[PDB]
Symmetry: C3
Amino acid sequence: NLYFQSVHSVAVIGAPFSQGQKRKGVEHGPAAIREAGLMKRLSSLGCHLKDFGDLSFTPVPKDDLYNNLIVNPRSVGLANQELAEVVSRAVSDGYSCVTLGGDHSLAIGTISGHARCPDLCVVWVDAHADINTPLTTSSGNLHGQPVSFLLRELQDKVPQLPGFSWIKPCISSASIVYIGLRDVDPPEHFILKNYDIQYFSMRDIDRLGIQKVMERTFDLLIGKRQRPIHLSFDIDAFDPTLAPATGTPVVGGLTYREGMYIAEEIHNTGLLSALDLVEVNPQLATSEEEAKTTANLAVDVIASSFGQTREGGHIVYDQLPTP
Amino acid sequence: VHSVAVIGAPFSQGQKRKGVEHGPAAIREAGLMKRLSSLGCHLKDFGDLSFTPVPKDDLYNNLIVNPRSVGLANQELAEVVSRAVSDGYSCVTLGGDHSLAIGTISGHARHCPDLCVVWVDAHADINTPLTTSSGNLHGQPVSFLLRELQDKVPQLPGFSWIKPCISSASIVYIGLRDVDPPEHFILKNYDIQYFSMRDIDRLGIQKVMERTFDLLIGKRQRPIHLSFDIDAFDPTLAPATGTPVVGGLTYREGMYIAEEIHNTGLLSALDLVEVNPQLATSEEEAKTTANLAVDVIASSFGQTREGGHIVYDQLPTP
Amino acid sequence: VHSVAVIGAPFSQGQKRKGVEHGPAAIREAGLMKRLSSLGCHLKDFGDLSFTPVPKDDLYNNLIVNPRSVGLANQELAEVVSRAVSDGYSCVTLGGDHSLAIGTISGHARHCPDLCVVWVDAHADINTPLTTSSGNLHGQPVSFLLRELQDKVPQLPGFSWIKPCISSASIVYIGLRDVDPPEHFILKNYDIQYFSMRDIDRLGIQKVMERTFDLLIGKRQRPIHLSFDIDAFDPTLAPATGTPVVGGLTYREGMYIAEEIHNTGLLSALDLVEVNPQLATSEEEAKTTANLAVDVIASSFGQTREGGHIVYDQLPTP
Ligand SMILES: NC[C@H](CCC[B-](O)(O)O)[C@H](N)C(=O)O
Ligand SMILES: [Mn+2]
Ligand SMILES: [Mn+2]
Ligand SMILES: [Mn+2]
Ligand SMILES: [Mn+2]
Ligand SMILES: [Mn+2]
Ligand SMILES: [Mn+2]
C-alpha cells in the first residue's frame, strides 16, 4: 500500500504508571496495547511513526502522603513533569503524541506539555470526572484528581503539593468538554455545575445521541476558531462488557460503536494534536479473551483517531486490475 | 427527601416456574434498604408478607392456574399497600410474579382516585381469563383493573373483592416485544397507548418518556404507579427472569425511564417483579439481575448518572 | 398469507472455514418451520440440496479456491430458486457461505429482472477475482452479479452461466464495518449506495430503511431480494460465524430491517447465510446464532414485537 487519504506524524509513548492509584497491574498496560499490534496498525494507516518506547520510572524512597490521604504525591508529580517534556518535544517538532497508560494521572503532564499550543482544548472521555481537588477527594488516589491541577479557576481551591510546583494552570472552563459521565462524586458535581464546565453524561448521550453530542462538543470548543485538540480517553468510558480490564468499571457505558464514532469525529476535525489512552489493566481479567478484547479496543480507538473507519477508505486504491 | 415504604411479596402462584418467591430476599440481599437510606429516604420496612394459602385450589375451567391463591394473596397485599399509601409513603413492592399488580394497583386506588400507571415490561399482561393460552395469572392483571374490560372478564374464584379502578387512557406501556394476538386487539381497540421496543428503536427513550407523561399527566398532576417487570430489560442484563424475551431495554434506557419518573415528582407506588434467582445459570448472574433491580428502585427515588442527589454547598480552601 | 419456499444450501467451498455447511440444519433445529407455520405462511421445504462434487478442482491463477465446485453448485441452486419464484413462492435460502447469493440472485433475476437487493452484511463482498486477498469466493459474490463490473471481472472455470443481472442502483448495503480498499473503491466509483454502522449511528435504523426504500422502490414497487449475512449483527449476538467483526447491528436493529422489508409486502427472495455452528465455543452459542437467524426470516414474513400478525377481531365474553 502506497496511497492514503491523509498522512499523520504520530509519536507513541509508553507510560507504565501504577502509583497514581492502588490497584496493581495497570503498569502492564502499554505492553498489552503493543502485544495486540498497535504499531503495525498505525503503520498500515500511513503514519510517520516516532516511538519513544516504554519509559522507565523510579519511585522516590522518602515520599510521605500529603494531608494523610494523597498517596505518593512526589512519585507522581516528578514523573508527570518529565512526561510533560517528552510530549512538548514531540508537539513542537510537529508530531501528534499518543500516550499509553497506566492510570489517568499521566494526563497532568501530557496536557501541560501540549500547552507549552496555548489555545488548546480537551475532550475528556471517562466514566469519572477526575476533577477531585486534594481536599474534596475521599480515596486519596491521584488518578481521580488530574483535572483540578490543570484548571485556571480551580487554582484557589487546590493547594501546593510536593513535586507539583512546576504545574501552571493552562486550560480554562470553556476549554474542556467531558463525554460519558456516569460515576460523578458529590464534590465533583459541584465543580462542574458552578464553574460552567459543559459536559455530556451517559444520560445526555441517551437524550441527544452520539452525533449531536460530538457536534455540540465541537460547537463549544472549536466553534469560535480552529484549536489543537487533546483527547484524554479512558478505557472505562466503555461498558465493562467491552472493557473488563480496568480499575474503576462502571455499568451502562459507551458502546464499541459510540467510542469509534467519538474517535472518528475527532479525526475528521483534523485538529487532534495529542491523545491519552489510560486504565488498561491486564491483571484485571477473568479470561484471555477478556484481556485481548480490551487491548484490541484500545488499539481501535487510537487507530480510529488517525484514519481507521467502518466504511474504510483510509487506504486509497489506485485502479481496478483489468483481466 | 421522600417517605418510602418497602413490602416484600414472596408469591409464585401467578405462574408455574418456581423461584420468583425468593425475589424480594435477593433484592434486599443486594442492599436495597442501605441504598435507599444513602439517598435520604424516610424508610418503613413492612417486611416479607406471609400469605394465607388455599389447600383446594386447582385448574379452573381446564385453563386458569391457581386462582383462589392469586386472588386472596392479592387481597391481603392490597390492605398493606392501602396502609402504606394512606400514611403518606411511596409504596415499593418487591415480587414475585406480575399477578401482584392486581393487589398493588387496587390498594393504591383506595386512596388515589386519579392515579395513572406506567407499565414497563416485555409483555402487556392484559389477557382476560378467557383470552389466555397458558392460564398463568401473571399475564392477566391489567384485565381485572381496567374498567373498559369489566364486561369481558368472568367472575373468578377469590376475585370477587376486585373492582376496576383504572381507565384505558390512564395506563401507558413501555418496552413491549412479546404480545399475544388477543392482547394486541385489547391495546389497539381500547386505545391503550404503548411504546414497544420498535417505537423505542424509532423515536428513542427521550421522546418515549416525553410522550408517556403528555398522555398521563399532560393536563393535570396525578400520582404515578410504576409497574416495572425485570424482564423489560434484555436477558443479557436480567437473566434471572421467568419469561426472557430477547431485544430488551439497555441498562441506560431503564435508568432513563426510572430517572424521568422521579423527575415528575409524582411517583406514588413502584413494583419490581419477576426477579427469579433460581433461574440464572450462575450465582453472579443471579446477583446481576438483583443489582439491576436495586438500580431501578434507586434511580426512581433520586439516584442519577450526573451525581446530583447528595447536595454539596461549600468547597474547602487551603 | 405468504407462500414460502425453504431451500437448504449446505455451501462450504466459498471460504476455507469448515462447519458453515451445517447451517441450514441448525436453523431448522431452531424451529424455522414451526415459526413460519404459526405465521400463517404456506410452506414448501426443498430439503438440503445435494450438490455435484468436483474432485479435479484446481485453484485459478494460484489464488481463487474451489471455483468449479462453487460455480456448479450455484448454477444448481439458481435452477431450484428459479423454479420456486415461478410457482409464486418467496424463496428463502439457508446457507452456507455468502457465495451462494450468486445462485440465489441469479435464479431470482430470471423471473424478476427488475429486482432490487438489500445486502445486510458486515462486509461488501464486492471483491473481483483480481482484487481478493484471501481467494475466497464468499467475499466475491456481488462482483459477478454487478452489471458495471463485467469488464473488470474475468471468466472463471464454471462461472459462464452467470450473466450480470443487477445494476449498481439496484443494490443497497446495510451494516458495513470491514470494507477492503478495492471494495471501498468500487462502492464510491460505481455509485453503489450503502449504510455502514457509522451511517446507522448517525441516522438511526428507521432513517436507514426509509432511505434504502427511497433509493430502491422510490419510483416503483419491485421484487425485494434480502441477502442477509448473519455476521451483520454484533459477534456477541451472532457468535457462530466465520468472519466476526465487532460493532455490529443490535438485535433490535436487525429485526427493524426485517419488519420494514415485510411492511412493503415486496419481499420475493431471502438468503440467510454464514451460520457456522462448528465455530461456536459452547452448545448455547450455536443455538443463540441459529435462533437469531430464525427471528430474522420470521420477522421478514410477519413476526412483530407489537404482535399484530395473527388476526384477532372479537374478544370472548363470559
Ligand atoms: N475478512 C474476510 C472478508 C470476507 C467476508 C465474507 B462474508 O462473510 O461476508 O460472506 C474479506 N472481504 C475477503 O474477501 O476474504
Ligand atoms: Mn480516569
Ligand atoms: Mn475512569
Ligand atoms: Mn409482567
Ligand atoms: Mn413480562
Ligand atoms: Mn457476506
Ligand atoms: Mn459477512
